[PDB]
Design a protein around this ligand. Structure first.
Ligand SMILES: Nc1ncnc2c1ncn2[C@@H]1O[C@H](COP(=O)(O)OP(=O)(O)O)[C@@H](O)[C@H]1O
Ligand SMILES: Nc1ncnc2c1ncn2[C@@H]1O[C@H](COP(=O)(O)OP(=O)(O)O)[C@@H](O)[C@H]1O
Ligand SMILES: Nc1ncnc2c1ncn2[C@@H]1O[C@H](COP(=O)(O)OP(=O)(O)O)[C@@H](O)[C@H]1O
Ligand SMILES: Nc1ncnc2c1ncn2[C@@H]1O[C@H](COP(=O)(O)OP(=O)(O)O)[C@@H](O)[C@H]1O
Ligand SMILES: Nc1ncnc2c1ncn2[C@@H]1O[C@H](COP(=O)(O)OP(=O)(O)O)[C@@H](O)[C@H]1O
Ligand SMILES: Nc1ncnc2c1ncn2[C@@H]1O[C@H](COP(=O)(O)OP(=O)(O)O)[C@@H](O)[C@H]1O
Ligand SMILES: Nc1ncnc2c1ncn2[C@@H]1O[C@H](COP(=O)(O)OP(=O)(O)O)[C@@H](O)[C@H]1O
Ligand SMILES: [Mg+2]
Ligand SMILES: [Mg+2]
Ligand SMILES: [Mg+2]
Ligand SMILES: [Mg+2]
Ligand SMILES: [Mg+2]
Ligand SMILES: [Mg+2]
Ligand SMILES: [Mg+2]
Ligand SMILES: [Mg+2]
Lengths: 249, 247, 249, 94, 249, 352, 252, 48
């Protein structure tokens, strides 16, 4: 084993800690103190400023999450999730002889061509899981029309952005694969069929188990939160990718 | 006995202070977390500091760390390519020693190559003078010394060839760190140098080889000449060292 | 399937490097003998083949493959069957360090094929009777040839072309050994003389007669008796360098 | 994963009736010999070594090394119950 | 759920089982064994809870909740740790069938709103009083079991489970009198399915069924409301705790 | 502690078969005592090569064999329903009622279920010689065994059974021979003449399955000759029986109440295993079935076709079952469960 | 290994099929690593053909044995395509293990290797050109992949990420074709995918030079019927090994 | 040994055919079985 998979595992651990309290309806966590004073809370914005993280990669992830939180006071528990999913998929890539730099260039290209398409989803962003499931398909199409050593790091940036819609549906007791795949089947006929271009607002519903139009239902999210989250999760994944050794003094 | 183990406890303690600084070479150099004894961990991609604060404790390791200091007091920006050189020269000296030739022959044949290397790195130069960096001043060294090791006799034209083959490390690390295939691109670089091109080298922004010098960084000679000189001095000093005596 | 892969070509090569290292000390006229001892026998012979090879080495089914392929050289193309085991051993010993760099075995085989084409393309320039002059001189006129053409190959084969050059100089290095001479010093002091004065006949004087010029010592090698060594050894490597597994139920 | 152990589990439903009944029976079989005339004294050696013939219930239960905690109870509750009546121990414990 | 909403139910089960029998007029003492000498016998639930070091955060929360109820309402403080150990014991049978904690919490919190509708209905004025013994619990249980015949949903089994969980109060008022909890609870169920028999409870001292309009046991409808609210809230505050992680502050 | 080791073995006997119930049943690799891999879906052949040795489980297998020779189908019902009976008995003995109090409760509930069944029948076999009425009606028996070419085998077996058939009954399941010519092409199978099915498989391991399917097929024709009454398949009759038995248990007071309600919840374990073997969630479909059977549909069952938990009428779909085949199934399952419920403290015997 | 019933048994069978394929993978292609299998008589057999390696191999695991029987069945009647079949089968099994570790259930994975395979043979019989021929050396698994994922994007339900994994599991034939020649697969496959996105329905791995090449023009041809039979046999082997829930080993 | 199960609720067939390990219980069964052939069946009450 190498110390890149260890950083990936640390980021994945802090993710799995935070990712079950994401949506509006999400279970709580208990943070046992030193004396034992327990605080039961969702809203990972606090679970990240109270968690005892000792690993350096988890530490950097917490630092960039808090930086995002103080830049804009929203979308700090999704940054950690997207970053850890980027790290998981980037480790799977590197483990088949894809240099971390090619993956980093791919993530840069993807995060730069995703905010240049979110400006075709803006009005605020539909929210829910709409922008994620739309960027998934758009980037999976934009990757293949490039064909460079980084054509595989944009298709693992597109299948790893649907971790928000895929964890917004296990925190709603509905499903993981079925609901997200109905979401990613409505957004397909919004980039393939020009008539049904209004199917790009169809996010998912957390009350009932069926995707609805999150423009005719007012579940918007400010564009500067989604853009900042994609732009900070990308930097977090990149920062934890560009390390490859731990020097002991 | 002791010579053949204190020429392999230094060449394996300097070749382990180079493979802790190697993938931090270039613009797209991988970072490296540094674990302090207190516990806080910082992240840097420059090999100067990693060597600065390393607690080396080994004679040859210190000889190689004090080489970065000499190189940045002499040229300013060579502080992790000269260590990579003087660690791959010792890698080559590990095989040259198993063959059975004496360290006072792989020490008078490096200065026999370094003096030719000086006259190869002063022909590439564009007299302002500047040399075409990026990997050229090392693939050209490898190619020209291999061509020149065929005109040399005795044990000499067996260590100069090892010098040339050890020069093909900075191009390899620059190609790796740039997200390339190191062996294939190094062979293409050598095949592009034999065909005349002396400005070639890994363009790390594009992601591949390039001949146009506009976006091909150019460096002064002092840095490359100083790197060769100081690295050859250090490997000569390490080779002619046995019996670390405690007074 | 135990020990399959690029760790099965470090065992196959450690196996084919044992049958070669034993035969590495019997090339020259000053070839140190071996003792034949089986259930009944005390023969002392230094020759080759059945006299040495095919009465030993039942191991790894690959030493049995070297000895299985060396039967084609003797009985059939004169008796030059020690030079093909030593050359195959040298080619595999260089492939051992070519594999560590991460060059697929097939690539090394294609490199050896190109280099053998160049060498046999150079031996036929030195027909001087039908005849290629040189005890240790034919393998230094080709090593000088395939070293130049090496840098005219832009693929990974270039590394294999150079390893083939470095391995062709093992015949005039067991000729320097097996005598009271220094292998590297003597091999080079006559390699630097084939350049700087064009005479491919200069070779090792295994017999200490005194002149390093095999044109006048009248030590000759039949041309088809050298076009086989350079070929039968490469056709032996490309059969040991390409098998990936030895399964034994 | 801090503090996930549900400790403190002893003596379930009978495991405690059995223990307490065995302790009471042992305390009975200790004082069984001292009842009535023609009884039997006990020694009660202290740390210094002051022996004390002590055939009775009060001085015995109030001064002897009773190991079992349940018997220690029965003695702390029986000693504090024979100062309103004068002396009726050694019959209580039995 | 996972091994965290099943390691919070075993803490609740443990706490309930410790005091379960310390309930009724026929209470049963417990022995508290200190480090040095030990035994102090008390049939008071609170002291038993205020003197055992549980060290588990779930148990620490049940003890905390119980103390608060005791220092708020006084009575009905050992009927709160029960109905929270019992309502959690039945929750685990659904967290084993891959039913999200959100679904049972959406069933518990739904049963409560119907739990406090019959206490308002079976009460008698002079605020109001509710039939003591087990009558109030069996009446609420039967009411919920009749309201759960028109659910037609997946949150229908957790609804009946809560109903049948408000029987541990009669189940213990019968177990402390020596009677058979089964042959008597079935008779209570039978009695409560009729029209006017909503006050039939358990004579806590004889172990027989008596109409509480004739025995004269009545509990104020503010210690039977805070009891049920606090129970069904500690049953959804320990079911939505997905992780017990470290905390530094 | 000795009546729970019996139940905990009848469970494990019912879990290696539960997963092979519906048309979407799994398909396990039963190594033969002769080491010949024939991966088979049939769960009566599984018992032959499993050789369960625990004596408590052996009694459920004996009841399964009784069902296999009394009628020709329902072999899984007899050991996926008796397994639920005992799993719920252990869930009821721990409350403490006794072995004695739940056996007679199960007997009362089984007597009730045998009086509900003749009110659940919804179809018949008016003409047992009309070839479409013998194919489309014998489909389910093979469909449950060999999903896919369910209708081709249905017709090809309808031809054989209708051909050799007197005017009075006397159908002989041993009359229809089954050849196994090792040809290629399932469609090439035909019926020669007492009849015979040539059954040209491809590898003499994908026609042995078809041979067992033919067995289960013609065995349905035999029972159809004795009792024409047909009940809705695919969990419909099971959910209806469970509903009515739960109602009966709610009316009846006493300690038999618990055992009767558990007998109903043991009937719900048939559509649960039918759905759990298809990917859909079991609770979703049991709720969607109980909620449509309360309105009074009486014929709706599991929809194997869809991906999500779905309900579908089974009369209009033609997925029926046989009355006798479930009467005997419930009877033998109850008798097997109450038997190994009686048995306590399995002693070893004296060497004769 | 657990290998008891359900997910554990399926994972065990998947790993066994991975092993039995890994023992033949390098043999795929015109120029492929040989294998030195020795019998009990001391004969050394060097053969770069998957048929003659499976007929000389001890198959002592049930799932591996069934896969090898299906491979031998393909080799007996058709000939060509007895290692591509087992390769595709083991890859189909390898790319649903991450989805079968959850409770996706095999019955549903089976209604994804039968809809997708029927669609792929339809696409083959629709895109084949004239006896009917399709460009080999990849150029189909790199097109059937592009078609199957572009079609699975239009599937609402669980079969979206199973056909999309069926498609991704076809890229192995154009992958080890170049992984055997040592061609840095992650580049040639990237070029093939980029060239199949735009157009080039016949562009596959070239073996004479490390680059993509129109395989229809280069006359590296494969009979459409043979490809259809290989695809169907591989998918059926997958479904078989996915449809197995337990191993009932008779006690005697 | 062969595996022939036998539901045997009674005293005679049980005491006469079960593996009674303890020698004293083996006695009580050899003396109780030989004592219920003059009365017909009264075991299971004798042993109790
Ligand atoms: N009512 C809702 N319906 C659907 N999706 C929602 C709703 N509320 C929030 N979300 C989605 O949940 C995601 C996670 O938000 P959350 O974790 O609650 O806070 P933060 O914005 O800090 O991450 C957001 O991207 C948002 O689009
Ligand atoms: N733009 C560039 N393109 C290619 N190579 C570069 C570039 N800039 C610097 N290099 C290479 O980096 C090496 C210098 O080492 P460097 O990493 O700059 O030391 P430091 O760690 O002090 O920054 C030289 O080999 C030089 O050729
Ligand atoms: N007199 C000599 N001087 C120098 N080299 C010689 C002489 N005689 C033979 N050789 C060299 O010895 C080698 C042959 O070794 P040999 O023992 O003949 O092997 P083999 O058993 O195959 O015949 C050739 O390289 C040949 O050139
Ligand atoms: N002389 C006696 N003869 C017969 N019984 C006696 C005599 N003296 C005392 N007893 C009985 O012995 C019993 C127990 O007395 P003992 O245990 O020795 O002291 P205490 O009376 O304090 O318990 C008394 O109930 C008494 O009736
Ligand atoms: N005489 C009695 N008969 C039957 N039940 C009684 C009697 N007295 C109290 N109870 C019941 O005992 C239960 C618990 O009372 P108690 O043990 O004092 O603790 P709590 O504070 O939990 O009520 C209540 O449900 C109450 O109605
Ligand atoms: N197409 C179908 N859809 C739904 N349920 C079915 C379907 N076909 C059969 N069933 C049900 O599943 C059962 C499958 O038969 P199977 O269990 O193999 O036979 P047995 O009754 O002998 O166990 C049928 O008896 C019926 O109850
Ligand atoms: N000359 C070639 N160039 C590129 N690909 C080829 C060539 N010959 C065969 N292939 C590919 O190699 C794959 C494997 O074929 P091979 O191993 O030779 O026989 P089989 O098809 O029986 O495995 C085929 O799918 C084919 O497309
Ligand atoms: Mg928010
Ligand atoms: Mg620099
Ligand atoms: Mg010779
Ligand atoms: Mg007295
Ligand atoms: Mg009270
Ligand atoms: Mg059936
Ligand atoms: Mg072929
Ligand atoms: Mg009698």
């Amino acid at each position: 084993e190498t110390i890149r998979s260890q950083n990936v595992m640390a980021a994945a651990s802090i993710a799995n800690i935070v990712k079950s309290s994401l949506g509006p309806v999400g279970l709580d966590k208990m943070l046992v103190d030193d004396i034992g004073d327990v605080t039961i809370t969702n809203d990972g914005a606090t679970i990240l400023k109270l968690l005892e993280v000792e690993h350096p990669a988890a530490k950097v992830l917490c630092e960039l999450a808090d930086l995002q939180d103080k830049e804009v006071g929203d979308g700090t528990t999704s940054v950690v999730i997207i970053a850890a999913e980027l790290l998981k998929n980037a480790d799977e890539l590197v483990k088949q002889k894809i240099h971390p730099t090619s993956v980093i260039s791919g993530y840069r290209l993807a995060c730069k061509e995703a905010v240049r398409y979110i400006n075709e989803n803006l009005i605020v962003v539909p929210g829910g899981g709409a922008v994620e499931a739309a960027l998934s398909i758009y980037l999976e199409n934009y990757a293949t029309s490039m064909g460079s050593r980084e054509q595989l790091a944009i298709a693992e940036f597109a299948r790893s952005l649907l971790v928000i819609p895929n964890t917004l549906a296990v925190n709603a007791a509905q499903d993981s694969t079925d609901l997200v795949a109905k979401l990613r089947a409505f957004h397909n006929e919004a980039q393939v069929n020009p008539e049904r271009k209004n199917l790009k607002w169809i996010g998912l519903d957390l009350s009932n188990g069926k995707p609805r139009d999150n423009k005719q239902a007012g579940v918007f999210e400010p564009t500067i939160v989604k853009v900042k989250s994609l732009k900070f999760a990308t930097e977090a994944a990149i920062t934890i990718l560009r390390i490859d050794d731990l020097i002991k003094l | 006995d002791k010579p053949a183990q204190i020429r392999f406890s230094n060449i394996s303690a300097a070749k382990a202070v180079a493979d802790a600084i190697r993938t931090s070479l270039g613009p797209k150099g991988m970072d490296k977390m540094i674990q302090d004894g207190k516990g806080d961990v910082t992240i840097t991609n420059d090999g100067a500091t990693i060597l600065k604060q390393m607690q080396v404790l080994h004679p040859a390791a210190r000889m190689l760390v004090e080489l970065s200091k000499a190189q940045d007091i002499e040229a300013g920006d060579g502080t992790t390519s000269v260590v990579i050189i003087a660690g791959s020269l010792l890698d080559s000296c590990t095989k040259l020693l198993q063959k059975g030739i004496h360290p006072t022959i792989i020490s008078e044949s490096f200065q026999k190559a370094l003096e030719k290397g000086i006259e190869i790195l002063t022909d590439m130069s564009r007299p302002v003078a500047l040399i075409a960096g990026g990997g050229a001043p090392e693939i050209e060294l490898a190619l020209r010394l291999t061509e020149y090791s065929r005109t040399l006799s005795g044990m000499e034209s067996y260590c100069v060839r090892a010098f040339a083959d050890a020069m093909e490390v900075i191009p390899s690390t620059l190609a790796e760190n740039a997200g390339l295939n190191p062996i294939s691109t190094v062979t293409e670089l050598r095949n592009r140098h034999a065909q005349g091109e002396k400005t070639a080298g890994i363009n790390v922004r594009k992601g591949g080889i390039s001949n146009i010098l506009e976006e091909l960084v150019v460096q002064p000679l002092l840095v490359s000449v100083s790197a060769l000189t100081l690295a050859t001095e250090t490997v000569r000093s390490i080779l002619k060292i046995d019996d670390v005596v405690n007074t | 399937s135990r020990l399959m892969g690029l760790e099965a070509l470090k065992s196959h090569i450690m196996a084919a490097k044992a049958v070669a290292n034993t035969m590495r000390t019997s090339l020259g006229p000053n070839g140190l003998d071996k003792m034949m001892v089986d259930k009944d026998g005390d023969v002392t012979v230094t020759n080759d083949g059945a006299t040495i090879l095919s009465m030993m080495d039942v191991d790894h089914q690959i030493a049995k493959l070297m000895v299985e392929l060396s039967k084609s050289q003797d009985d059939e193309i004169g008796d030059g069957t020690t030079g093909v085991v030593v050359l195959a051993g040298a080619l595999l010993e260089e492939a051992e360090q070519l594999l560590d760099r991460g060059i697929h075995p097939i690539r090394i085989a294609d490199g050896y094929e190109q280099a053998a084409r160049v060498a046999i393309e150079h031996l036929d320039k030195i027909s001087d009777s039908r005849v290629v002059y040189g005890g240790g001189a034919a393998e230094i006129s080709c090593a000088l040839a395939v070293s130049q053409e090496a840098d005219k190959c832009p693929t990974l084969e270039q590394y294999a072309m150079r390893a083939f050059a470095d391995a062709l100089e093992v015949i005039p290095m067991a000729l320097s050994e097996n005598s009271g001479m220094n292998p590297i010093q003597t091999m080079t002091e006559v390699r630097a003389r084939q350049v700087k004065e064009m005479n491919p006949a200069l070779g090792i004087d295994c017999l200490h007669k005194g002149t390093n010029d095999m044109k006048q010592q009248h030590v000759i090698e039949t041309l088809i008796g050298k076009k086989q060594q350079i070929s039968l050894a490469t056709q032996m490597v490309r059969m040991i360098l390409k098998i990936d597994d030895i399964r034994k139920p | 994963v801090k503090t996930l152990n549900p400790k403190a589990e002893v003596a379930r439903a009978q495991a405690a009736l059995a223990v307490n009944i065995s302790a009471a029976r042992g305390l009975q079989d200790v004082l069984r010999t001292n009842l009535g005339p023609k009884g039997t004294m006990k020694m009660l050696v202290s740390g210094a070594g002051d022996i004390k013939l002590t055939k009775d219930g009060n001085v015995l239960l109030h001064e002897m090394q009773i190991q079992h905690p349940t018997a220690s109870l029965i003695a702390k509750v029986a000693t504090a119950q024979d100062d309103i009546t004068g002396d009726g121990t050694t019959s209580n414990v039995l | 759920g996972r091994k965290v909403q099943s390691g919070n139910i075993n803490a609740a089960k443990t706490i309930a089982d410790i005091i379960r029998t310390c309930l009724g007029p026929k209470s049963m003492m417990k022995m508290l064994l200190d480090p040095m000498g030990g035994i102090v016998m008390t049939n008071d639930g609170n002291a038993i809870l205020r003197e055992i070091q549980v060290q588990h955060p779930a148990a620490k929360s049940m003890i905390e909740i119980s103390r608060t109820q005791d220092e708020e309402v006084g009575d009905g403080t050992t009927s709160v740790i029960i109905l929270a150990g019992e309502m959690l014991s039945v929750a685990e049978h659904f967290l084993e069938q891959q039913m999200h904690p959100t679904v049972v919490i959406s069933a518990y919190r739904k049963a409560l709103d119907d739990m406090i509708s019959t206490l308002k209905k079976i009460s008698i004025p002079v605020p109001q009083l509710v039939p003591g013994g087990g009558a109030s619990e069996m009446a609420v249980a039967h009411a919920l079991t009749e309201k759960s015949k028109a659910m037609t949903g997946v949150e229908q089994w957790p609804y009946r489970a809560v109903a049948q969980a408000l029987e541990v109060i009669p189940r213990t008022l019968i177990q402390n009198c020596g009677a058979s909890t089964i042959r008597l609870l079935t008779s209570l169920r039978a009695k409560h399915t009729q029209e006017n028999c909503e006050t039939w409870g358990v004579n806590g001292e004889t172990g027989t069924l008596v109409d509480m309009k004739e025995l004269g046991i009545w509990e104020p409808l503010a210690v039977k409301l805070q009891t049920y609210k606090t129970a069904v809230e500690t049953a959804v505050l320990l079911l939505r705790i997905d992780d017990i992680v470290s905390g530094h502050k | 502690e000795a009546v729970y080791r019996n139940i905990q073995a009848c469970k494990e006997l019912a879990q290696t078969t539960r997963t092979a119930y519906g048309p979407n049943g799994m398909n396990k690799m039963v190594i033969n005592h002769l080491e010949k891999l024939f991966v088979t879906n049939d769960a009566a052949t599984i018992l032959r090569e499993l050789e369960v040795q625990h004596p408590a489980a052996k009694m459920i297998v004996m009841a399964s064999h009784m069902q296999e020779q009394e009628v020709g189908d329902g072999t899984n019902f007899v050991l996926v329903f008796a397994g639920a009976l005992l799993e719920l008995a252990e869930e009821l003995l721990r409350i403490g009622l006794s072995v004695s109090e739940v056996i007679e409760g199960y007997e009362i509930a089984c007597r009730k279920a045998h009086e509900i069944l003749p009110n659940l029948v919804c179809c018949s076999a008016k003409n047992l010689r009309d070839i479409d009425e013998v194919s489309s009606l014998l489909r389910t028996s093979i469909m449950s065994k060999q999903y896919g070419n369910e209708v081709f085998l249905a017709k090809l077996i309808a031809q054989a059974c209708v051909s050799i058939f007197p005017d009075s009954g006397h159908f002989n399941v041993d009359n229809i021979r089954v050849c196994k010519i090792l040809g290629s092409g399932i469609s090439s199978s035909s019926v020669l003449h007492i009849s015979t099915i040539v059954l040209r498989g491809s590898t003499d391991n994908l026609m042995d399955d078809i041979e067992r399917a033919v067995d289960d097929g013609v065995n349905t024709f035999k029972v159809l000759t004795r009792d024409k009454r047909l009940v809705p398949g695919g969990g419909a009759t099971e959910i209806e029986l469970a509903k009515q038995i739960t109602s009966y248990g709610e009316t009846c007071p006493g300690l038999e109440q618990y055992a009767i309600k558990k007998f109903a919840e043991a009937f719900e374990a048939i559509p649960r295993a039918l759905a759990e073997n298809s990917g859909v969630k079991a609770n979703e479909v049991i709720s969607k079935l109980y909620a449509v059977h309360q309105e009074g549909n009486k014929n709706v069952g599991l929809d194997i076709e869809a991906e999500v938990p779905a309900v579908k009428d089974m009369l209009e779909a033609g997925i029926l079952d046989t009355y006798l085949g479930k009467y005997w199934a419930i009877k033998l399952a109850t008798n097997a469960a109450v038997t190994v419920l009686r048995v306590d403290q399995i002693i070893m015997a004296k060497p004769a | 290994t657990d290998s008891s019933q359900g997910i554990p048994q399926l994972v065990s069978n998947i790993s066994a099929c991975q092993v039995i394929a890994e023992a033949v993978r390098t043999t795929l292609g015109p120029r492929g690593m040989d294998k030195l299998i020795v019998d009990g008589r001391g004969k050394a057999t060097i053969s770069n053909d998957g048929a003659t390696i499976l007929k000389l191999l001890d198959v002592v695991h049930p799932a591996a044995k069934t896969l090898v029987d299906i491979a031998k069945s393909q080799d007996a009647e058709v000939g060509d395509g007895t290692t591509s079949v087992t390769l595709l089968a083991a890859e189909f099994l390898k790319q649903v293990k991450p989805y079968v570790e959850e409770g996706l259930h095999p019955q549903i994975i089976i209604r994804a290797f039968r809809t997708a395979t029927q669609l792929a043979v339809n696409k083959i019989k629709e895109i084949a050109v004239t006896d009917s021929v399709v460009a080999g050396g990849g150029a189909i698994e790199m097109e059937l992949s592009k078609y199957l994922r572009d079609y699975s994007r239009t599937i609402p339900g669980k079969q979206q990420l199973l056909i999309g994994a069926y498609a991704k599991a076809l890229e192995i034939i154009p992958r080890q074709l170049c992984d055997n020649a040592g061609f840095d697969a992650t580049n040639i496959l990237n070029k093939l995918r980029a060239r199949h996105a735009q157009g080039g329905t016949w562009y596959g791995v070239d073996i004479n030079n490390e680059d993509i090449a129109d395989n229809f023009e280069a006359f590296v041809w494969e009979p459409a019927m043979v490809r259809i039979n290989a695809l169907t046999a591989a998918s059926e082997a997958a479904c078989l090994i996915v449809s197995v829930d337990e191993t009932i080993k008779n006690p005697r």
